Amino acid sequence: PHRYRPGTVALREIRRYQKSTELLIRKLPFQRLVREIAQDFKTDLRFQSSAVMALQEACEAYLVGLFEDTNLCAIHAKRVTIMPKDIQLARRIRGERA
Amino acid sequence: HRYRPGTVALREIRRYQKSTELLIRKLPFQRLVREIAQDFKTDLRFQSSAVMALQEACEAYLVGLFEDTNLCAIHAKRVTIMPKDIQLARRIRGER
Amino acid sequence: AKTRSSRAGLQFPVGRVHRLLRKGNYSERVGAGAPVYLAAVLEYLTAEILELAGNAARDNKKTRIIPRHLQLAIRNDEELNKLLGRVTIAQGGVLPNIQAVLLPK
Amino acid sequence: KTRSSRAGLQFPVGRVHRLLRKGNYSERVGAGAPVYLAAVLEYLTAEILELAGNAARDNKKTRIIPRHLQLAIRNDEELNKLLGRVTIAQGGVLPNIQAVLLPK
Amino acid sequence: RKVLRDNIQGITKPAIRRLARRGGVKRISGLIYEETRGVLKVFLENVIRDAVTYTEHAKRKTVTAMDVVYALKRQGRTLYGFGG
Amino acid sequence: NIQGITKPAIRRLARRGGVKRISGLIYEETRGVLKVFLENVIRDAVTYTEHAKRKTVTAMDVVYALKRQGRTLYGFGG
Amino acid sequence: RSRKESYSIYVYKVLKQVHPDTGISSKAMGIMNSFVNDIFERIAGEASRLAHYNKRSTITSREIQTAVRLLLPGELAKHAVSEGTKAVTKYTSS
Amino acid sequence: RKESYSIYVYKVLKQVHPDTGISSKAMGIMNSFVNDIFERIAGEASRLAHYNKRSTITSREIQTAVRLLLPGELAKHAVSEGTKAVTKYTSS
DNA sequence: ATCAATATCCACCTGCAGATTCTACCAAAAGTGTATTTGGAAACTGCTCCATCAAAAGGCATGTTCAGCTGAATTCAGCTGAACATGCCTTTTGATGGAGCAGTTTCCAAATACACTTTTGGTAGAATCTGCAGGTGGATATTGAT
DNA sequence: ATCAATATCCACCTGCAGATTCTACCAAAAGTGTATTTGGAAACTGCTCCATCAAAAGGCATGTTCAGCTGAATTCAGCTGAACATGCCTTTTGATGGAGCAGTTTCCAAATACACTTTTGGTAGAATCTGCAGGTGGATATTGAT
Ligand SMILES: [Cl-]
Ligand SMILES: [Cl-]
Ligand SMILES: [Mn+2]
Ligand SMILES: [Mn+2]
Ligand SMILES: [Mn+2]
Ligand SMILES: [Mn+2]
Ligand SMILES: [Mn+2]
Ligand SMILES: [Mn+2]
Structure with a gap:
């Protein structure tokens, strides 16, 4: 049977999701997460759907940027696979929690 | 007598980390400042405090950048910092 | 009666900008030329972005500008990218870019 | 007699009020807002002074120099965060060497 | 009301992988996904914290999009589109 | 003139930064970065001095410029 | 009822x-409105700070101009200053 | 003249x-600190008042501003000190 | 080097959700008269800030030697990607109830606005007090081989 | 490892200026008392829009298999960059003085605020219009194996 080589479908997906703009995290789970965190901060809070959407936009944008910088960190260590070490480095240089 | 390569480096590190003094000489730096400012505005003049402030800012910035750079050198299983490291540092910093 | 926008030859509302200046507590007093100048600048920047975005929309064969086109416009222009370095455009996405080392050998 | 005294503070309530209204923040300034603010400023000042003294002489010096301040700010987590993008003049840096750079 | 628990696991592995793909990432370590969940949790915690602070300063019980925008703006992550 | 900032000075800066070993191209790269930094800060500062209809760049112009750059500096008036 | 403002028509x-x-698109228009309000707040903020730096109580077109010089990059700043000065000088001819 | 928080x-x-x-330089650092924190709090409070269309800045705006700007513990102690000073001020 | 297997590039069409246009109310410019500051022209003064200029004292440029680190090359276990069967849960789209914004009023606690009055905090001055900033023995640290 | 021989660092005590701290006097805040507005908390309620539910269907998450190629581990040479002795030169200290800014006031024309009245452009709605989303089959393009 047919089979693509490891890495090809990956690049394919990179191009695909770099062409589009839709949110990549599922909506309802994200809403659950937000409501959980918020509830832990303050009880009986209600959200405008707009607020949830804004939160998701900001979140995924942030994660994509962080993934870019992380990828640069992986490439810097003569690697191709990104690692927790890479993310921690990117976070430190950014100054998020150095 | 001759110290094994890498010890005097650690020595200097401990010293200048334990100190607070400015590391760039005053007059060359001030000259550079006046030159750079001159190509923005003709024959300007500076308070001594302004030049000193500029030097503090510069040295602080460069020390921090050298810290992040050093981290970038460590990350690539190295010890020697390279222009590549500085480049990665400022690129992640958002300066690029 | 003429609007100050027409007198200044602007599309952007001089009067509104002026009111926003006074009702924003930036200073107790506001000059007569400040809202005109500011409205002119905002109108210009709006014009530039709408231009580049319009081009990006023509490139992708679309009559209507969407946030994607705005994102392409901002990120492909150096100066607009710098002016909006710490800004996120909703539904914008990113520039198509793959690190060379990742490409097939 | 003075607003600072009636609040049991060292920081100038009146001066803070004057600055607040003369800083283009809003048209009207509450009576208690400068009190609250001056109190906060006095507290933060107190914290920094305390830590910077404790650190002032673990180095045998009485006079608090910018170095001691820097040590106090960077050794404390929350103060380090509050002053994250701030440069203390003549403060230097904390003694920190990566273990990788150490021999043997 | 049904109790909300362990919803950070809602952010599935394929989703994180997609976010990585848009970020130009080709290969992903197995230890990445949990790290991502952690970082995301911190970010979302901070943003939501400031947002709700705004919400209850306005004596409101409903978190508005403007609260989120103000929060993000304060966090240094200005967001266009919901600016209202 | 930019070469007034020299190899031993840059080395000392890297030492305070905790750097152990240093490449040769590092010094030139650093001179470049420093040049850019001073260019931006002094640019904004001179702009401030020029709005104030002055010919003497004050310490406060430098402090304002630095703050605007995101490099807040304590101990010079602000 | 409720009446909100925006820069949509402009x-x-x-x-x-x-x-x-x-x-x-209405979304893209939202992006644009956010942009205009953001740049507005930046310019007005910088102008406020400068006007405050020199003990002046009035924000004139000059403060706006310097605010633009500070905030906007090269060519963008050039053409912005041009459009501004143009609009002002044209306006003064009431 | 010039006014500073030196004596305080x-x-x-x-x-x-x-x-x-x-030290004098350290006093400069402290002055810069008080000024910076002042501008931060006042700015955040001004934005707070503008968001909710309030034209006055009360101690409430100040408190919320502190909650936003200061990290956990520092924020708590600051809030308590502030409310304390307010109640004591209104006690006479 | 050639021939499938599959993903991707487009052009086709077209009904509908979203964008555009059209039309009466009305908040907010705009116009006009009059009250209130404002920020630079003249005139001026005293901190700064330069510009030479004479000196030493340390810092740097420089050239030689080599310790050892960087980066190329090779090797291999194991991890992470690709394909798929399985089936769960997130969609989609509707329909509610009602919480709780947000528009409208409605008094008063609290702010502002001058008008005097009292205190303080800022300067230029005396009379303090402390860390450099050397010199010296002893313990560390480092590097080589009885 | 703990035997020596450089060098290094440290810790003790001795000591003044280059700064700190503590005081005799003043303009300008800061406070006080007396009226004048007003922002907005309180209250009521019209009205989005938020929470929640149902049901069903297919997108897509999850778990397993399996092996490709990645990253980690190791080896080794070559050359890059640290250590150091060496010698000149640009630094730093520092006395200066002539002046040119910057900071300060005094009038006062020009500009901006304020208050009321007129006018219209901007908005919310509904009526109207049309890109293009989300489907289709068809010719390329790419990738993989043989
Ligand atoms: Cl010394
Ligand atoms: Cl003269
Ligand atoms: Mn055109
Ligand atoms: Mn055109
Ligand atoms: Mn109050
Ligand atoms: Mn419709
Ligand atoms: Mn009155
Ligand atoms: Mn001893």
């Missing part, structure tokens, strides 16, 4: 100016 | 460390 006027056969 | 910082210093002096 953005659309300018859009029609630069691309007569181009429309704009 | 000195008084507080004599409160916490009665037998400890302070």
Whole structure:
């Protein structure tokens, strides 16, 4: 049977999701997460759907940027696979929690 | 007598980390400042405090950048910092 | 009666900008030329972005500008990218870019 | 007699009020807002002074120099965060060497 | 009301992988996904914290999009589109 | 003139930064970065001095410029 | 009821100016409004700070100009200053 | 003239460390600190008042501003000190 | 080097959700008269800030030697990607109830606005007090081989 | 490892200026008392829009198999960059003085605020119009194996 080589479908997906703009995290789970965190901060809070959407936009944008910088960190260590070490480095240089 | 390569480096590190003094000489730096400012505005003049402030800012910035750079050198299983490291540092910093 | 926008030859509302200046507590007093100048600048920047975005929309064969086109416009222009370095455009996405080392050998 | 005294503070309530209204923040300034603010400023000042003294002489010096301040700010987590993008003049840096750079 | 628990696991592995793909990432370590969940949790915690602070300063019980925008703006992550 | 900032000075800066070993191209790269930094800060500062209809760049112009750059500096008036 | 403000009609006027056969999404228009308000707040903020630096109580077109010089990059700043000065000098001829 | 928080910082210093002096440059650092935190709090409070269309800045705006700007513990102690000073001020 | 297997590039069409246009109310410019500051022209003064200029004292440029680190090359276990069967849960789209914004009023606690009055905090001055900033023996640290 | 021989660092005590701290006097805040507005908390309620539910269907998450190629581990040479002795030169200290800014006031024309009245452009709605989303089959393009 047919089979693509490891890495090809990956690049394919990179191009695909770099062409589009839709949110990549599922909506309802994200809403659950937000409501959980918020509830832990303050009880009986209600959200405008707009607020949830804004939160998701900001979140995924942030994660994509962080993934870019992380990828640069992986490439810097003569690697191709990104690692927790890479993310921690990117976070430190950014100054998020150095 | 001759110290094994890498010890005097650690020595200097401990010293200048334990100190607070400015590391760039005053007059060359001030000259550079006046030159750079001159190509923005003709024959300007500076308070001594302004030049000193500029030097503090510069040295602080460069020390921090050298810290992040050093981290970038460590990350690539190295010890020697390279222009590549500085480049990665400022690129992640958002300066690029 | 003429609007100050027409007198200044602007599309952007001089009067509104002026009111926003006074009702924003930036200073107790506001000059007569400040809202005109500011409205002119905002109108210009709006014009530039709408231009580049319009081009990006023509490139992708679309009559209507969407946030994607705005994102392409901002990120492909150096100066607009710098002016909006710490800004996120909703539904914008990113520039198509793959690190060379990742490409097939 | 003075607003600072009636609040049991060292920081100038009146001066803070004057600055607040003369800083283009809003048209009207509450009576208690400068009190609250001056109190906060006095507290933060107190914290920094305390830590910077404790650190002032673990180095045998009485006079608090910018170095001691820097040590106090960077050794404390929350103060380090509050002053994250701030440069203390003549403060230097904390003694920190990566273990990788150490021999043997 | 049904109790909300362990919803950070809602952010599935394929989703994180997609976010990585848009970020130009080709290969992903197995230890990445949990790290991502952690970082995301911190970010979302901070943003939501400031947002709700705004919400209850306005004596409101409903978190508005403007609260989120103000929060993000304060966090240094200005967001266009919901600016209202 | 930019070469007034020299190899031993840059080395000392890297030492305070905790750097152990240093490449040769590092010094030139650093001179470049420093040049850019001073260019931006002094640019904004001179702009401030020029709005104030002055010919003497004050310490406060430098402090304002630095703050605007995101490099807040304590101990010079602000 | 409720009446909210925006820069929509002006953005659309300018859009029609630069691309007569181009429309704009409500989302994209939202992005634009956010942009205008953001740049507005930046310029006005910087101008406020400068006006405060020199003990002046009035924000004139000069403070706005310097605010633009500080905030906007090269060519963008050039053309912005041009459009501003143009609009002002044209306005003064009431 | 020039006005600074010099004497106040000195008084507080004599409160916490009665037998400890302070350098001039360090006093500059402290002045810069008080100024910066002042502008931060006041700015955040002004934005707070503008968001909810309030034209006055009460101690409430100040408190919320503190909650936003200061990290956990520092924020708590600051809030308590503030409310304390307010109640004591209104106690006479 | 050639021939499938599959993903991707487009052009086709077209009904509908979203954008555009059209039309009466009305908040907010705009116009006009009059009250209130404002920020630079003249005139001026005293901190700064320069510009030479004479000196030493340390810092740097420089050239030689080599310790050892960087980066190329090779090797291999194991991890992470690709394909798929399985089936769960997130969609989609509707329909509610009602919480709780947000528009409208409605008094008063609290702010502002001058008008005097009292205190303080800022300067230029005396009379303090402390860390450099050397010199010296002893313990560390480092590097080589009885 | 703990035997020596450089060098290094440290810790003790001795000591004044280059700064700190503590005081005799003043303009300008800061406070006080007396009226004048007003922002907005309180209250009521019209009205989005938020929470929640149902049901069903297919997108897509999850778990397993399996092996490709990645990253980690190791080896080794070559050359890059640290250590150091060496010698000149640009630094730093520092006395200066002539002046040119910057900071300060005194009038006062020009500009901006304020208050009321007129006018219209901007908005919310509904009526109207049309890109293009989301489907289709068809010719390329790419990738993989043989
Ligand atoms: Cl010394
Ligand atoms: Cl003269
Ligand atoms: Mn109050
Ligand atoms: Mn055109
Ligand atoms: Mn055009
Ligand atoms: Mn419709
Ligand atoms: Mn009155
Ligand atoms: Mn001893």
